Amino acid sequence: NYNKAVEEEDKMTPEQLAIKNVGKQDPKRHLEEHVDVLMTSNIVQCLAAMLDTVVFK
């Protein structure tokens, strides 16, 4: 919901990026927060092998 809540603005970003291309006015990066979201999402991947070990032996 936060990812889509940022993508709704990222739909409007290519217009400004398609108009000015000079200077940065928004202090939000929209990148590192999504990287952190991916880091929190990788817990499923890292613990899937843990469930594989608990189920195996």
Binding site: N42, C46, A49, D52, T53, V55, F56
Partner: protein, 136 residues
């Protein structure tokens, strides 16, 4: 080979028609067309070809996914000479029931215990931490 050299002789179109019938697999048309070959002396070689493809035709018709009855093998198979039921009893090595051909070991494999694919999934996770975090 279609170099348009003659294109009207039966021997020029014979291998492509026999190979196209091989793609169809219909053996009745070949057996009924056995007497259609002229006095050309390669009819015995055509019989050698039938002798080297009868193992594949008979092997494919005797695949026996579930079961097949002898009353179809009487017509599909060759003459009453018991060469197929003798050689195939020592080649296939199956059970002979009351005038019927039984099919075993068909979809009888037991599924996996899900233990080994979980271990290879753990190795895949190791490769995911590797490739996702290697340069870092």
């Amino acid at each position: 080979l279609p170099a348009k050299d003659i294109q009207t002789n039966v021997y020029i179109k014979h291998p492509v028609s026999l190979e196209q019938y091989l793609m169809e697999g219909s053996y009745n048309k070949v057996f009924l067309a056995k007497g259609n070959i002229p006095a050309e002396s390669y009819t015995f070689f055509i019989d050698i070809l039938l002798d080297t493809i009868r193992d594949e035709i008979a092997g494919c018709i005797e695949k026996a996914y579930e079961k097949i009855l002898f009353t179809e093998a009487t017509r599909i198979l060759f003459f009453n000479t018991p060469k197929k039921m003798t050689d195939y009893a020592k080649k296939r090595g199956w059970v002979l029931g009351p005038n019927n051909y039984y099919s075993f070991a068909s979809q009888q494999q037991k599924p996996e215990d899900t233990t080994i694919p979980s271990t290879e999934l753990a190795k895949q996770v190791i490769e995911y931490a590797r490739q996702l975090e290697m340069i870092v």
